[PDB]
Amino acid sequence: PMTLGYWNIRGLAHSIRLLLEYTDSSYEEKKYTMGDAPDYDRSQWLNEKFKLGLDFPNLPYLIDGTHKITQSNAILRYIARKHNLCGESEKEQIREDILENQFMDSRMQLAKLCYDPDFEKLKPEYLQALPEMLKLYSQFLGKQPWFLGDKITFVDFIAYDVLERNQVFEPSCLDAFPNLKDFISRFEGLEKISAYMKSSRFLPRPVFTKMAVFGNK
Amino acid sequence: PMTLGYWNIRGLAHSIRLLLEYTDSSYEEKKYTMGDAPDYDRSQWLNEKFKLGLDFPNLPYLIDGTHKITQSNAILRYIARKHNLCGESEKEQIREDILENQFMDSRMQLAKLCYDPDFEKLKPEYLQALPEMLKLYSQFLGKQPWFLGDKITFVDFIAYDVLERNQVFEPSCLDAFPNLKDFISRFEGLEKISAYMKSSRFLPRPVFTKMAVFGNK
């Protein structure tokens, strides 16, 4: 069937895997692993980096027969598109594009933090800004079940990951935001997701992200 | 008319401004000015920010009728749809997406480099990798006039914003890639784009300057 690739960790691939599972898409996981050390032993990827035939060699990637997708957003939009899980009205499409880009920013903000040696320095800064970021998502989501109304589209999967991350990082921060917390329940509650949340196709070790300082002791 | 807002500088808004001009959309510029005092931090914009009624306030932003759009790629895609400058085929759908994200990443490359003082030492590193990413873009553009075949779409606007910006950094870069070097000429030769570039309202200020907090001397 189609194949998904990324490093052996949740990361950017987490939101994609979830979608592949929600849509029951038959896929294969060919995850590369990294040798954490001062010299960053990433050979695993390098030796097959160009052997794949992708236009822009990068992880994550997906190869659907003749289709070769690169970069999360492209991949997500692809499966979603081939499953009608997109936005219809100009309004839904606008929200859709704003969200995809908005969350991506948030992912990057936290990511840099969890990657910096001076974690302790920026950490307090991030915390005293996290609530204001969330407030915006709270208001937007409102009382609608999903970010695009009654329709659960791909942006929801992206949303779940970004929110779930900040929750694991600081559970107490999203306490003041009911609709957000309950949103995470709507997602995890989805029959197909819950079943997957507890299966072999998941990370044994409780670490959600590893890149340089985090994911290693 | 529409109300496009951003700091008086090229930035992300540059690719949008060109798209608007080309599509003959009567846009209204609301260009804010950055820090004048030593601590060149955001100022005037902050006094407005929330009062605009933006779901997620951030620059740039476009306000068309009842559509308050933020995030560069959201605005870009919005206008693309309205004027049919989007990918029609699934083959073109994956292409526009990959490229969309691929270019934003590349822009980030130069940006991050500019945002830091160590520039003088990091420059050679980035410079040494330039040919690599350009080989990919050239190979992708291949023989075809535009990145999505024979018809101009929005990616060509983000591509120009990235490629051209690179030529400004080091003119020699695209020399080894004639089709990209030619692409630039062709894009700049478009009736509307030409009219816009010769008209007193095109270039605000240089790229690195102000953004990289560099004061000319």
Q: Which domains does chain A have, with CATH numbers?
A: 1-85+191-217 (3.40.30.10), 86-190 (1.20.1050.10)
Query: Are residues A190 and A197 in contact, defined by beta-carbon separation less than 8 angstroms?
Result: no
B61-64: strand order across its sheet: B27-32, B2-7, B61-64, B67-70
List of residues 6+ apart from A120 with CB closer than 8 A = none
Q: What is the distance, to the nearest Å, from the Cα of residue B194 to the centroid of all Cα atoms in its chain?
A: 17
| Residue B6 assigned ligand-binding role | yes
Helices (H) and strands (E) in chain A, counts: 9, 4
Query: Are residues A59 and A116 in contact, defined by beta-carbon separation less than 8 angstroms?
Result: no
Picking from B31, B15, B145, the residue whose alpha carbon sits closest to that of residue B80 is B15
Distance CA A184, CA A168 (A): 12
Query: Are residues B123 and B208 in contact, defined by beta-carbon separation less than 8 angstroms?
Result: no
Chain A contact residues (CB < 8 Å to B): 55-56, 67, 69-74, 77-78, 81, 90, 93-95, 97-98, 100-102, 105, 136, 139-140
Distance CA B166, CA B60 (A): 21
| Residue B71 assigned ligand-binding role | yes
Do the Cβ atoms of A97 and B81 come within 8 Å? no
Distance CA A186, CA A184 (A): 6
Q: Structure tokens of A120?
A: 């302790």
Q: Are strands B27-32 and B2-7 parallel, antiparallel or unpaired?
A: parallel
DSSP 8-class letter at A146: B
Q: Partners of B149 in the beta sheet?
A: B146
**Which among A78, A93, A97 has CB closest to B73?**
A97
Distance CA B46, CA B95 (A): 37
Picking from B78, B89, B92, B153, the residue whose alpha carbon sits closest to that of residue A92 is B78
Mutation target among B59, B67, B68, B71 for the A interface, most CBs of A within 10 A: B71
3-state secondary structure of A41: strand
Do the Cβ atoms of B56 and A97 come within 8 Å? no
List of residues 6+ apart from B37 with CB closer than 8 A = none
Of all residues in chain B, the one with the smallest CA distance to A90 is B78
Distance CA A135, CA A132 (A): 5
- Whether the upstream peptide bond of residue A60 has omega within 30° of 0, thus cis, is yes
Q: What is the distance, to the nearest Å, from the Cα of residue A95 to the centroid of all Cα atoms in its chain?
A: 18
Cα Rg of chain B, angstroms: 18
Q: Structure tokens of A202?
A: 């998941």
Q: What is the largest CA-CA distance in chain B?
A: 51
Of all residues in chain A, the one with the smallest CA distance to B137 is A56
Distance CA B92, CA B47 (A): 41
Query: Are residues B104 and B73 in contact, defined by beta-carbon separation less than 8 angstroms?
Result: yes
Picking from B79, B107, B62, B88, the residue whose alpha carbon sits closest to that of residue B19 is B79
Chain A residue numbers with beta carbons less than 8 Å from the beta carbon of B84 are none
Q: Structure tokens of A146?
A: 């999903």
**Which among A55, A90, A98 has CB closest to B71?**
A98
Q: Structure tokens of B65?
A: 């009728």
Query: Residue length, chain A?
Result: 217
Minimal CA separation from B95 to chain A, in Å: 9
DSSP 8-class letter at B214: B
DSSP 8-class letter at A87: -
Q: Structure tokens of B159?
A: 């591509």
Q: How was this structure determined?
A: X-ray
Picking from A122, A82, A115, A85, the residue whose alpha carbon sits closest to that of residue A100 is A85
What interhelical angle do A90-113 and A72-81 show, nearest 10?
150
Q: Structure tokens of A184?
A: 């995470």
3-state secondary structure of A35: strand
Chain B contact residues (CB < 8 Å to A): 55-56, 67, 69-74, 77-78, 81, 90, 93-94, 97-98, 100-102, 105, 136, 139-140
Q: Which residues of A are annotated as a binding site?
A: 6-7, 42-45, 49, 58-59, 71-72, 115
Query: Are residues B59 and B8 in contact, defined by beta-carbon separation less than 8 angstroms?
Result: no
Task: Name the amino acid, one letter, at A70.
Answer: T
3-state secondary structure of A69: strand
